[PDB]
Design a binder for this molecule. Sequence first.
Ligand SMILES: CN(C)CCCN1c2ccccc2Sc2ccc(Cl)cc21
Ligand SMILES: CN(C)CCCN1c2ccccc2Sc2ccc(Cl)cc21
Lengths: 159, 159
Amino acid sequence: SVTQTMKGLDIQKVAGTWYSLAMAASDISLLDAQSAPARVYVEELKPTPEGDLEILLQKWENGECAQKKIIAEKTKIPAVFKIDALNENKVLVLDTDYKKYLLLCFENSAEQSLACQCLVRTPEVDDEALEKFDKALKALPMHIRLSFNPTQLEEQCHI
Amino acid sequence: SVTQTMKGLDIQKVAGTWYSLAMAASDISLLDAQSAPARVYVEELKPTPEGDLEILLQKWENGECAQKKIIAEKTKIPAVFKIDALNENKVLVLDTDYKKYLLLCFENSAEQSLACQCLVRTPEVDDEALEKFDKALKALPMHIRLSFNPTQLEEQCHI
Ligand SMILES: CN(C)CCCN1c2ccccc2Sc2ccc(Cl)cc21
Ligand SMILES: CN(C)CCCN1c2ccccc2Sc2ccc(Cl)cc21
């Protein structure tokens, strides 16, 4: 369970282009296949004026790379947003420098499905951002991790 | 490319029961699906009197958990065995204490497919054996890692 958040977060400053450089999850089944439920590739983060967080992403669904937009609503905690659905889902922002890397996790309640990503601003392998990611995950019950190469990061659905 | 071998290896002492507690590989495609080519679950290591290494394992193939045996022949290097096939495949033993953990890698030539496992003697999560595994992998170009839980380790094909 995630007890690492970004103190002092300014969300407006996370807007723009992102790349899902690596991903990790609590169960193998969340990331194993091409259409696994947590295999989501972030494209853009779009904070709303009201301080909500629109997420633009790609997902492989029935043989193809589909585009999706979801909205995570603000909460009392600056680093935590809620996607109301069949479940209470939370987006947690763990850490960021705004200009290079952002670590975030998604979690529901059930047991608890948890997936986290290291997002970066450019199609480049950032070893320092990846160290910070592994550091964060040491405290979490993860059983699968994937990372993409720069070629893949320029393809839809990282193919 | 693997430049970590077990100095002083006595193979005869690796015989018996093993469990594939974690696995890592150079390409996502080698481990991603249930029937991915490197998704192999070790059952037993059986050194031959002549110093070859028989490997008993399970593999999910066309909807089912199949049993297989393969033979890796000795070489001039005690820690390196060869499986002659369509490719020159090597089994490399990186480290072991014989009684708890064994790290090993499999590699071919092409680019180079590489997969490594942390094997343990019991259906138990060995954090020290897993630290040694991550340490070993730091030097290798891995892009997917999986680890199993004790329930899974007692099921065929870790289902
Ligand atoms: C789009 N939908 C298939 C998944 C949305 C919810 N979602 C999520 C929620 C709870 C646990 C794990 C995940 S994976 C994930 C990765 C990226 C994003 Cl942006 C959202 C999620
Ligand atoms: C049985 N066959 C599907 C795979 C045999 C060769 N094999 C292998 C070789 C070169 C690169 C990667 C691998 S994965 C693997 C994992 C365990 C074992 Cl024991 C062997 C292998």
